[PDB]
Amino acid sequence: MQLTPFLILLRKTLEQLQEKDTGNIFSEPVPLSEVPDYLDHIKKPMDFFTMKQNLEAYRYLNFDDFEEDFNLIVSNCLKYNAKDTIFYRAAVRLREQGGAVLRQARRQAEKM
Ligand SMILES: CCOC(=O)c1ccc2c(c1)NC(=O)[C@@H](C)N2
Known part of the structure; x- marks a missing residue:
């Protein structure tokens, strides 16, 4: 397992996940200017721009740490917003479509 091909794969996977976010509602942090009470019960906000920064900072050295932050994007949104x-x-x-993207990416990593 070499670092450069792995980060190439995480970069491709991140792009495929952002493609599922057609509204671009997950591509940047939730604007606290518009949602001033957001951090009341959201202890770790997450978004795709932040994930890109973490990726390039070498904060994702295994698939599970990358997948965990994606799950955070999903769970924070389910937590903060009403079901309707x-x-x-x-x-x-996103959970459904991103899950398929992640399973295929993990298979490609497990070949490495
Ligand atoms: C410009 C104002 O838009 C929003 O209020 C807003 C913008 C983006 C948001 C969000 C709210 N809440 C969220 O949970 C996730 C989906 N992101």
């Missing part, structure tokens, strides 16, 4: 909102359903769909 667009945001909540978008997180459900």
Whole structure:
């Protein structure tokens, strides 16, 4: 397991996950200016831009740490937003579509 091919794969996987976020509602931190009470019960906010920064800082050296932050994007959104909102359903769909992306990516990593 070499570092450079692995990060190439995480970069490709991150792009495939962002592609599932057609609304771009997960690509940047939740704007605290518009959601001022957001950090009341969300102890670790997460988004795809932050994941890209963490990736390039070598903070993802295994698949599970990368997948954990993706799951955080999903779980934070399910936690904060009511079930009858667009945001909540978008997180459900991201969980479903992103899960398929991640399983295939992990198979490619397990070949390495
Ligand atoms: C510009 C104002 O838009 C929002 O209020 C807003 C913008 C982005 C958001 C969000 C709210 N809440 C979330 O849970 C996730 C989906 N991101």
